[PDB]
Amino acid sequence: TDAVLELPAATFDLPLSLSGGTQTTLRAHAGHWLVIYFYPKDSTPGCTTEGLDFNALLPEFDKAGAKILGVSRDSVKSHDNFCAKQGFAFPLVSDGDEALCRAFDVIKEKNMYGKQVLGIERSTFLLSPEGQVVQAWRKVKVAGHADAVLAALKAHA
């Protein structure tokens, strides 16, 4: 009833490689809210702006017991460098095989260059303590986005 997106059951058990060398799974986050934001490329202007915006709001997400994960298909080492340079205090998922991206249907196609071109569409989701995807933002506008996600989280929580 309250889900806006249905994930395959296996999605919740995928090993997600994080910055810093550990793995997590979505099921491992049971019992608390989770914000998952997908972005197309480490260390680019929009992705850096977005990450810094979430980072600045961490204490507000903490107040709500929520955790955040950023996701792109960059490598663990790329993510480590990005986190260190920017000072991010939340993890980044290295979804190199786009398994998590496909589950959330964020790999979108565009007819461009006389080709069918597939890429990550900037998107964010709110996952409830019981693993339901209860809100989505697609084709995300970075300006104001982290603030809007925090507001929605508070309203849902």
24 or 43: whose CB is closer to Na ion?
A: 43
Instruction: Report the residue closest to Na ion, judged by CB.
Output: 43
Q: Crossing angle of helices 145-156/45-56, nearest 10°?
A: 40
Spatial separation of the C-alpha atoms in residues 148 and 107, rounded to whole Å = 23
Contact string (CB under 5 A) for Na ion, positions 3-42, x = contact:
--------------------------x----x--------
Taking the complex as a whole, how short is the minimal distance between the CB of residue 77 and Na ion, in angstroms? 12
Query: Catalytic amino acids?
Result: 47
43 binds Na ion (CB under 5 A): yes
The DSSP line for 109-145 is EEEETTEEEEEEPPEEEEE-TTS-EEEEEES--STTH
77 binds Na ion (CB under 5 A): no
108 or 136: whose CB is closer to Na ion?
A: 136
Spatial separation of the C-alpha atoms in residues 20 and 18, rounded to whole Å = 6
Contact yes or no for 8/103 (Cβ under 8 A): yes
Residues 79-118 that bind Na ion (CB under 5 A): 82, 85
Chain residues that interact with Na ion, rule: CB under 5 A: 29, 34, 43, 82, 85, 127
